[PDB]
Amino acid sequence: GRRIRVQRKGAGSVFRAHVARRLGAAANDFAERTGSVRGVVKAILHDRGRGAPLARVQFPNMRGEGRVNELFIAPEGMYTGQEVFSGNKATLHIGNILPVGNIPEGTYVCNVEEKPMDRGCLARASGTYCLVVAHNMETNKTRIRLPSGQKKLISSKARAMIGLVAGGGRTDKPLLKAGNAYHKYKAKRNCWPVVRGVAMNPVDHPHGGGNHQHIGVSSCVPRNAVPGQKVGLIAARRTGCSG
Amino acid sequence: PGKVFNLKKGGAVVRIVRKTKPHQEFVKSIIQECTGMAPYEMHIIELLRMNKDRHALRYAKKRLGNIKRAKAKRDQLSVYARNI
Amino acid sequence: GRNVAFSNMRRYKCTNKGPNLIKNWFNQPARKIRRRQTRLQKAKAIFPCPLQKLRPSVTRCSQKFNLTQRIGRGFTLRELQGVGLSAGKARQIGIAVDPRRKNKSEESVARNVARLKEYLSKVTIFSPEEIQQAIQHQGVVMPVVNPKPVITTGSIAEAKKEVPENLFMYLRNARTARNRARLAKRDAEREAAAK
Amino acid sequence: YKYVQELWRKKQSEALHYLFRLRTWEYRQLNAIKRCSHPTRPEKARRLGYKAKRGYVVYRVRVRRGGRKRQCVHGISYGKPRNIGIVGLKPSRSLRALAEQKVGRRLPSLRVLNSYWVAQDGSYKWYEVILIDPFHPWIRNDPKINWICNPVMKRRECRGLTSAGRKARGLHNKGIGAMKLRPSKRAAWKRNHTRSLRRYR
Amino acid sequence: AGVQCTAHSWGPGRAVARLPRKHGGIGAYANFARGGHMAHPTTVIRRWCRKVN
RNA sequence: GGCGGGCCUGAGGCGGCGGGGGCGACGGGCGGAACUUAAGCAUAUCAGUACGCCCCGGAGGAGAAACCAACCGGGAUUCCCC
RNA sequence: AGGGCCCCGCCCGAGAGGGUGCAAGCCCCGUACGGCGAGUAGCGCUGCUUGAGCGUGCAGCGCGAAGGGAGGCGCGGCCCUUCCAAGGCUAAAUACGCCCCGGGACCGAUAGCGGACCAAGUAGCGCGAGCGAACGGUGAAAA
RNA sequence: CCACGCGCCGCGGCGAGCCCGAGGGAGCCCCCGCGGCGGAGCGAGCGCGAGACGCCCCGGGCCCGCCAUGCCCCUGCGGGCG
RNA sequence: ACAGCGUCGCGAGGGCCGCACCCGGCGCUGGCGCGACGUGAUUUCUGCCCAGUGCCACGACCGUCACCGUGAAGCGAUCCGC
């Protein structure tokens, strides 16, 4: 037999991310730890692959000279020229970044750092928001409702933008034609078209081929399966469409 | 058999020719008060003090190597538990 | 096939590849000529001196050959006291010295002490014409000859006091003694358990 | 140094365990092949054959503590069933030898003498090698060590002619059990497995 | 002798005889073929020396 | 607080002096097959072989006993005959 | 064209050979002949190896001595015989190509090296790693 | 075809012997030259250890071991004789 | 193949692959996301069955099932246990 498609995808050859012409990547300094750093939203631009609009904002170079440009997935409501403020004393508005503990209960968040000064981690996708819900002053950990709905505990000094990311409703649009997928996947990595494994001859895929094209033994594959064995639904608690 | 059987062996006369270096012991005592005991040994000295010596000849053979060198480790260690 | 005793040969290894394990002796005449010239050049380097050196007389090792004598590595320091010489002096007079060798018998020291005495008597030491006409020893110095055996013509009656009558029984009694006594411990031990 | 040989014999002692705890920590936060200003253990250096003469350099090489993993790709050895092993093979040569070979490659100009042991951590062992500069006038004009500048002794450690080599080849064992490895492991087999075909036969 | 050639048999269905054939299709490495290794080569191992008592 | 003086670890640069690569052999250290043989085939066998890798030298390796033996004993190594 | 025959001789410490226009000791070159000892040993558990078998040598990890090793069946107790591991050096006798020299009861151009040829690892062929041929003779003199 | 084991058969030398072993000899086809193998078996081993006959062959008879058995004994789980 | 339709894992101290190791891809990504699967635009729908075989449990520890550890023993290997 041969290494299946998932196995080859590890190499990074022909399956790498097409990150060219991308705008770029989207620090708790002392001045922003003590207070708040003012900024202006110079422009909002379209990144390749990322559905959400990014934004370039410039803040004074606290280090000593110049204006330092930043790139931030932008929340819905941004205006070029917006007085974005990031810091502990930043007021509650869309675009501002303040430590999650400061955020009042329920205020939507985006770009929540998992740990303090992680420079961005959760809720950065199109039209995805988080919900600040419970603050415990003891360990200073505020539960946020992650987009998936699973609730995690985020340290109070971890910060995030206020609002929900723009691009909201991007998926609720039927693509209609194969071409519109080709051109979404051209921007992203080479994963489309996807050939089914029932289609492949027995040598290439474990589902394989037989005189009648079936998946053979149950699709469910155990969590402890070897890298070639994990081809069907993995660790499936339940299968089937239900209620 | 490991020798040929000669009822008389010895038509020829045979040869009759066949220590601690105590200064080193003085080197050892100076090191012993600077270093202390070994942690395996401290367990053997405790085992001798509270629970027999059969266990403290088994724990020796296991933590060291052979019985001859273990029975020795018992003697050197025995002095500390019994003396106090 | 038929009644062939089984071949004990070993199947040929690395025949056409790897290590060259076939070493035909086509140089046997050539090597003998090469060794002769080299030996002759060594002899010339010290014309008075012998090419080889006096070696100790040693009993051949193991019971099968332990009644004859062969030449060995060197004379022991105790055997050097017999000629009254130190190890370094012995090298000067052509005596090889095995300081490791231990005589293992007082009798061993004496055959060796005699051999050492002869070398010291035979040798002549020079520190011009005499060196030119000295004539060096050719061959191993004093090669030890094991004598052929003899018959000693002793007396029958005197020898009969030495051996017990029915000699076979005496030899057998001590041959089986370890086993016969062992049975006695097993036998006595069996009796002790009951009565 | 007798009072320094005995002090070390008690390595498990707290005194030297504190020292070792700091020494393993520093070697860890330091490079692989580091040149040592002095032999970290002088007595062991002198026993192996280190004098403080110009032309004698000490270098410490860290080796990974571990069991061998074969180079077979994708984890599979495509031969007969006996050969199918990849994760549990154990090195042929002692880590000591490995440290010397790594130091010898890093400095090919210098010659390797013997190596001592300096410290150990569950992840890596640190053996300290003693190397000699074969060209310094002092070394060439010193009767005792002149044998290192003989060109037969080039790359002692690549040809396993050191002590670690003499332990792996098993040369250290003498007598019954080494009879079949003395001329060399390979040569002894060669001499035994040869058809002489003597001419007069 | 004759072994200093790379010849592998062409195989049936090519019409030509199946003997080791060099890349050219030229016969090679056969006791008969031109330039082939002799069927059993002469070797020094022969005992040129008999023995007499 | 700062600023020199040694000791000690570490930097740059110069001077001299070495290293590298080449040999279809022999010699050392390695990593290491499989066809083959077992009339099949798994241990075995080929074979501590090819091949890969790194090393010297005119030789190399080895070598002065933590040796053999059990005797009316030998006594570093290597090579030969058996 | 004799280095052929036929009569006769000469030299040999040289009658090995090669050349010369036919078979040459004596036609030429030659040849014989001259001269100037501690993270160790051990032990346990694995792998690797050996003929070494309750283990030949090795290694990983754990654990680690002081009088300690060996004696070819283990394990304890008692002796004996023999040696000092955990540091080094050291000629000799041994091996062997390229390279040069001699001899072959060797092959004599489909043979013998792939390659006896004025230009063979060449002409060529293959992207490449690589593969790899064929081809000697006029005569005494080009007359 | 050639080497190398092994089984026979013929022949040559020598015969309770026999042997160009490796080597060494101003030595190469000449001299000198050890193991080996045979001369005794049998038993797992401790061990024990062959004679009585005959052209030859074949059989018979006994003798040596290994395996039981009886008896007698001396230097006794040992020796002898059946 | 495809648009659509479902199923499934996963909150980064994480999923899933590379990979002798050193460690790399998705990821210049973050659940409107990355992967793994089926089915194959719409219109209309999608019955019943968990026996078996898969899978899943901040579902427990019933029994069985290792190395270490630890008990009892034996001089000591070792063995019985827990």
Amino acid of residue D36: C
The whole-angstrom separation of Cα E4 and Cα D192 is 31
The whole-angstrom separation of Cα E44 and Cα D162 is 42
Dihedral sign, Cα of residue C168, residue C173, residue C178, residue C179:
positive
Longest dimension (CA), chain E: 62
- Residue to mutate among D9, D10, D17, with most B CBs inside 10 A, is D10
The whole-angstrom separation of Cα A98 and Cα A88 is 5
D19 interfacial to chain B (CB closer than 8 Å): no
A177 CA, G8 C1': separation in Å?
127
The total of other beta-carbon atoms located within 10 Å of residue C128's CB is 5
Q: Which of C13, C14, C24 sits opposite D197 (nearest CB)?
A: C24
- Burial environment of residue A116 by CB neighbours within 10 A (0 to 12, 13 to 18, 19 or more): middle
Show residues of chain C in contact with E45, CB under 8 Å: 22, 24
What are the backbone angles phi and psi of residue A56, rounded to the nearest 5°? -110, 125
CA-based nearest residue to C98, from C123, C79, C70: C79
The total of other beta-carbon atoms located within 10 Å of residue A78's CB is 19
What are the backbone angles phi and psi of residue D133, rounded to the nearest 5°? -80, 110
The whole-angstrom separation of Cα D149 and Cα D137 is 11
Count of D–E CB contacts within 8 Å? 8
Q: Which two tokens stand for residue C182?
A: 């062992």
Q: Which two tokens stand for residue C21?
A: 């394990």
Answer whether D33's CB lies under 8 Å from D106's CB.
Answer: yes
C114 CA, G2 C1': separation in Å?
82
The whole-angstrom separation of Cα B73 and Cα B65 is 10
The whole-angstrom separation of Cα A228 and Cα A217 is 15
E19 annotated as ligand-binding: yes
CA distance B16 to chain D (A): 27
* CB contact set of A143 (below 8 Å; sequence gap of 6+): A133, A134, A151, A152, A153, A154
Answer whether D131's CB lies under 8 Å from D57's CB.
Answer: yes
Q: Is the peptide bond before E20 cis (omega within 30 degrees of 0)?
A: no
Which residues sit opposite C174 in a β-bridge?
Answer: none
- Residue to mutate among B3, B8, B13, with most C CBs inside 10 A, is B13
The whole-angstrom separation of Cα C55 and Cα C97 is 8
The whole-angstrom separation of Cα A134 and Cα A101 is 9
The whole-angstrom separation of Cα A100 and Cα A130 is 11
* CB contact set of A44 (below 8 Å; sequence gap of 6+): A53, A54, A55, A74, A78, A80
What are the backbone angles phi and psi of residue A25, rounded to the nearest 5°? -100, 130
Helices (H) and strands (E) in chain D, counts: 7, 4
* CB contact set of E38 (below 8 Å; sequence gap of 6+): E1, E2, E31
Give the count of alpha carbons within 13 A of A219, CB side only. Answer: 12
Provide the residue count of chain C: 195
Interior/surface letters C7-36, b for 16+ CB within 10 angstroms, e for the rest: eeeeeeeeeeeeeebeebeeeeeeeeeeee
- Burial environment of residue E50 by CB neighbours within 10 A (0 to 12, 13 to 18, 19 or more): exposed
- CB < 7 Å to strand F — which of 52-91 in chain D? 70-71, 77, 79-83, 89, 91
Answer whether A54's CB lies under 8 Å from A73's CB.
Answer: yes
CB-based contacts of D138-142 (< 8 A; 24+ apart in sequence): D138/D53, D138/D54, D138/D55, D139/D53, D139/D54, D139/D55, D139/D56, D142/D53, D142/D55
Dihedral sign, Cα of residue A192, residue A196, residue A200, residue A205:
positive
CA-based nearest residue to D65, from D42, D98, D43, D87: D98
- CB < 7 Å to strand G — which of 50-89 in chain D? 65-67, 82, 85, 88-89
Among all residues of chain D, which has the CA nearest to that of B39? D12
CB contact under 8 A, E45 and C22: yes
Among all residues of chain B, which has the CA nearest to that of C176? B5
**Which DSSP state fits E46?**
S
Answer whether C76's CB lies under 8 Å from C98's CB.
Answer: yes
Experimentally determined by = cryo-EM
Answer whether D167's CB lies under 8 Å from D94's CB.
Answer: yes
The whole-angstrom separation of Cα C195 and Cα C190 is 10
Task: Return the SS3 of A232.
Answer: coil
Q: Which helix (H) or strand (E) holds A68?
A: strand A67-71
Dihedral sign, Cα of residue A72, residue A77, residue A78, residue A83:
negative
Answer whether D104's CB lies under 8 Å from D34's CB.
Answer: no
Amino acid of residue D93: R
Q: Which strand H nucleotides have any atom less than 7 A from protein CB atoms?
A: 1-8, 12-13, 18-29, 46-49, 74-80
- Burial environment of residue D29 by CB neighbours within 10 A (0 to 12, 13 to 18, 19 or more): exposed
**Which DSSP state fits D18?**
H
Amino acid of residue E21: R
**Which DSSP state fits D143?**
T
Q: Which two tokens stand for residue D5?
A: 């040989």
A219 CA, I45 C1': separation in Å?
26
Chains E and D touch (3+ CB pairs under 8 A): yes
Helices (H), chain D: 2-9, 14-28, 42-48, 95-106, 137-140, 163-168, 185-192
Which residues sit opposite D130 in a β-bridge?
Answer: D58
Q: Which helix (H) or strand (E) holds C32?
A: helix C28-45
Is B32's CB less than 7 Å from nucleic acid strand G?
Answer: no
